[PDB]
Amino acid sequence: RNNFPASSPERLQDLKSTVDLLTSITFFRMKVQELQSPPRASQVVKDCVKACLNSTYEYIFNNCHELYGREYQTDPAKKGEVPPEEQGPSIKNLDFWSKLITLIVSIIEEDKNSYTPCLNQFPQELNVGKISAEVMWSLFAQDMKYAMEEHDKHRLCKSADYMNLHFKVKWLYNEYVA
Amino acid sequence: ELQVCVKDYCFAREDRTVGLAVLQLRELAQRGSAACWLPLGRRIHMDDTGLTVLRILSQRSNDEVAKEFVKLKSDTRSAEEGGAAPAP
Amino acid sequence: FLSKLKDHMVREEAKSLTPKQCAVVELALDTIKQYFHAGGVGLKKTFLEKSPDLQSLRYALSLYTQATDLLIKTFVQTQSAQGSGVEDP
């Protein structure tokens, strides 16, 4: 994602030609070095994708505010380095989580939409949009569960706010994850 | 059988397996209810047939039950903070 | 096959004994049994069928086709020692 941003079709093509080169190397190992079980080009890449997705998740879960901030935030004064207790989870509000929901959506979209087509060489094995949705939800759901348990001890947001969050989460799961 | 796993909760990182214990529900079929202190291991201990069934189930690498079974038996303590390999 | 899908060594599917290679072997074995029987000149069909060597071979073969739940039940019923004291807790 960082090395071949979707915003550069040229680096998406160099990316495509890179995986064509990596198939060409796997094929050299298989055919010229005559190796019997060289690293399979789809699994090699799937690791790299999982890697890039997990780096994405870590970075979003730690920097939710800076990211949601700059990428969408409904108040320009809230785009910057909001406190770490609001770039990761807040006990005061549910807004970090509404923000994290939108981050997750956006990434799964870019993966589904720019990268799944760029990286079609193993289409059967490598739906970048699905690998994105799974990885990101998994990492999310853990974090969200602990958050809701933490809110429950403090009850600083109103009942209503958690009901609103429930409809958003209900929607999100029932969209991407289910 | 119950498989009881202790894990360290780790946002940003990964939730590290601290340890694993197996309880056979054959025992409970007599006991009805049991208080027990399960000692935790680093990996589950196996015979040739467990290891044969496991290598067979791992070839069913699209069956979700097999995947989760294989994954679950193949869970071991992420070694660190107190050690890697157990005894059987 | 420890190495290629019990163990960590290769992200290959190992390729099981496939239904066709389960057959072929089960038929090679019936032929070997007929050979060792040699129309009564060799070993009795009864010794050969009761052969623990053959029964063991058949058992291992039977595992390679068995259903996921049945493999899992087999695991729980066989791994009885996963319930009598962890060592190095």
UniProtKB/Swiss-Prot annotation, chain A:
Tissue note: Expressed in brain, with highest levels in the olfactory bulb, striatum, cerebral cortex, hippocampus and cerebellum. Also expressed in pancreatic islet cells.
Domain of life: Eukaryota
Protein localization: Cytoplasm; Cell membrane; Presynaptic cell membrane; Presynaptic active zone
Function: Plays a role in vesicle maturation during exocytosis as a target of the diacylglycerol second messenger pathway. Involved in neurotransmitter release by acting in synaptic vesicle priming prior to vesicle fusion and participates in the activity-dependent refilling of readily releasable vesicle pool (RRP). Essential for synaptic vesicle maturation in most excitatory/glutamatergic but not inhibitory/GABA-mediated synapses. Facilitates neuronal dense core vesicles fusion as well as controls the location and efficiency of their synaptic release.
Domain remark from Swiss-Prot or TrEMBL: The C2 domains are not involved in calcium-dependent phospholipid binding.
Record family assignment: Belongs to the unc-13 family.
Assembly mode: Interacts with the N-termini of STX1A and/or STX1B1 and DOC2A. Interacts with BSN. Interacts with RIMS1 which recruits UNC13A to the active zone. Forms homodimers via its first C2 domain. Also interacts via this domain with the zinc finger domain of RIMS2. Part of a complex consisting of ERC2, RIMS1 and UNC13A. Also part of a complex consisting of UNC13A, RIMS2 and RAB3A. Interacts with FBXO45 (via SRY domain); leading to the degradation of UNC13A by the proteasome.
Name recorded for this polypeptide: Protein unc-13 homolog A
Source lineage: Eukaryota, Metazoa, Chordata, Craniata, Vertebrata
UniProtKB/Swiss-Prot annotation, chain C:
Disulfide bonds: none
Phenotype caused by lack of the gene: Mice display normal synapse formation but abnormal synaptic vesicle maturation and die shortly after birth. Heterozygotes exhibit impaired insulin secretion and abnormal glucose tolerance.
Localisation: Cytoplasm; Cell membrane; Presynaptic cell membrane; Presynaptic active zone
Superkingdom of the organism of origin: Eukaryota
Entry domain remark: The C2 domains are not involved in calcium-dependent phospholipid binding.
Function noted in UniProt: Plays a role in vesicle maturation during exocytosis as a target of the diacylglycerol second messenger pathway. Involved in neurotransmitter release by acting in synaptic vesicle priming prior to vesicle fusion and participates in the activity-dependent refilling of readily releasable vesicle pool (RRP). Essential for synaptic vesicle maturation in most excitatory/glutamatergic but not inhibitory/GABA-mediated synapses. Facilitates neuronal dense core vesicles fusion as well as controls the location and efficiency of their synaptic release.
Subunit details: Interacts with the N-termini of STX1A and/or STX1B1 and DOC2A. Interacts with BSN. Interacts with RIMS1 which recruits UNC13A to the active zone. Forms homodimers via its first C2 domain. Also interacts via this domain with the zinc finger domain of RIMS2. Part of a complex consisting of ERC2, RIMS1 and UNC13A. Also part of a complex consisting of UNC13A, RIMS2 and RAB3A. Interacts with FBXO45 (via SRY domain); leading to the degradation of UNC13A by the proteasome.
This protein's name: Protein unc-13 homolog A
Source organism of this protein record: Mus musculus (Mouse)
Highest classification ranks of the organism: Eukaryota, Metazoa, Chordata, Craniata, Vertebrata
